[PDB]
């Protein structure tokens, strides 16, 4: 109901954690397991590559259709670019229903 593709077997969840590396244990044994760990974190890169199957229009409409254009005007800030201090902003939501076809 939010829109999208309903999938019985969706893309599976990729779960990730840091392996716990404990600090120094005491000299004698104690079975109350571990509260002392080495405070750490990880970083890295992650790349996702989805292939999408397109469906071409077969339209026999005569007149021009409605497009998603950018307003060519004297603007202070370009749409869908970064700001004066590098904040990336998205000025409006873009749907996907622009082309037409008969019912």
């Amino acid at each position: 109901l939010m829109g999208g593709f309903g999938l019985k077997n969706p893309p599976p969840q990729i779960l990730i954690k840091n392996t716990p590396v404990p600090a120094n244990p005491p000299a004698e044994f104690s079975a109350t397991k571990f509260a002392s760990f080495i405070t750490q974190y990880s970083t890295g890169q992650v790349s996702v590559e989805i292939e999408w199957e397109l469906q071409k229009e077969n339209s026999k409409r005569w007149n021009p259709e409605v497009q998603y254009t950018s307003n060519y005007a004297k603007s202070a800030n370009v749409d869908f670019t970064v700001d004066n201090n590098g904040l990336y902003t998205e000025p409006r939501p873009i749907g996907t229903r622009y082309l037409t076809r008969p019912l």
Partner: protein, 104 residues
Amino acid sequence: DGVGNASGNWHCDSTWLGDRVITTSTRTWALPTYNNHLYKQISSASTGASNDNHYFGYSTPWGYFDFNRFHCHFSPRDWQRLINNNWGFRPKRLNFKLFNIQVK
């Protein structure tokens, strides 16, 4: 091959292939008789023109086909589907046809 047999069909489609577009365009024409079949010579003496607009020429009883405008081949939709996602175009070859002639 006439009389009761058409010598061509109405082709007016526009197939957009990959790195090319083939535009076809059929029109119905009408050709009168010009000059009453004469080669009348035309000039600027009878007009009374300026020095810049003087001319000397010849008018013929012949017509001519011209398809030298872009809307003779592109619809407004096919023009929009041309100008918005192409960095260029040029014509490769044309193919002319003249058919279903009716002299009245």
